[PDB]
Design a protein around this ligand. Sequence first.
Ligand SMILES: [Ca+2]
Ligand SMILES: [Ca+2]
Ligand SMILES: [Cl-]
Length: 258
Amino acid sequence: GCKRGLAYGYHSKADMDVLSPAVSWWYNWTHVPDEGVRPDYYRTLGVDYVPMVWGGGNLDSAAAGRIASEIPEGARFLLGFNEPNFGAQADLSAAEAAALWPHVEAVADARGLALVSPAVNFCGGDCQETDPFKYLDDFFAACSGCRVDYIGIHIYTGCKGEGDNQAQWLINHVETYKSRFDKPLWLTEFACDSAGSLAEQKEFLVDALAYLENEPRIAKYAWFSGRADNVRHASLLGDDGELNELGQAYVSAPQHAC
Ligand SMILES: [Ca+2]
Ligand SMILES: [Ca+2]
Ligand SMILES: [Cl-]
């Protein structure tokens, strides 16, 4: 249904009150929703929680059972491993990710969840695989019998883009995924990474959402993040329950069919 989500794990009730007019889903890199809004408040607001299996550690049938019984009632999706191609994140070869996928698929089969691939991006340092398109080709080869409904991607570019479209470098990467793969896409983290001022991140966000809302191959997208320390000007929230100017732009931006 509605595409606009958030990648954040520390929502308060008041935070979700001000986001929920347009932010219809979120995830938090684990499989149980943020303590501040659980077990009922997010459900009463009608915001969807999407669980994740972040990585490959401590994973077997017993763990799959536990995760399936801990994910809340109402789940419909399950995200696969986070940035496995990065040594500093889930740190799995495409072959290892494919070999452990049965545990992820066992959770989704038990609970009736649609599956998002492990989420990839370009890696430049400490990389199992630098090239995200290659990683995914290799994963699908190694996971030939596996259920994967959607492809997970992360994009972080500079803020200036091309001509009047400050999001052109992000658009160009989505167009590469669209040519390299046929499955629908979830853009589970994005922001620009060079913002010299708030105005630079705001113009990038506005042009990015106009593209993502109107691109049918993007099923869902999630801004990084509610409160971020290390991506300059990327936070949406200030004080408890207060959107900042960037949050207001994210909530107010036009939506496709929704
Ligand atoms: Ca281990
Ligand atoms: Ca512009
Ligand atoms: Cl609650």
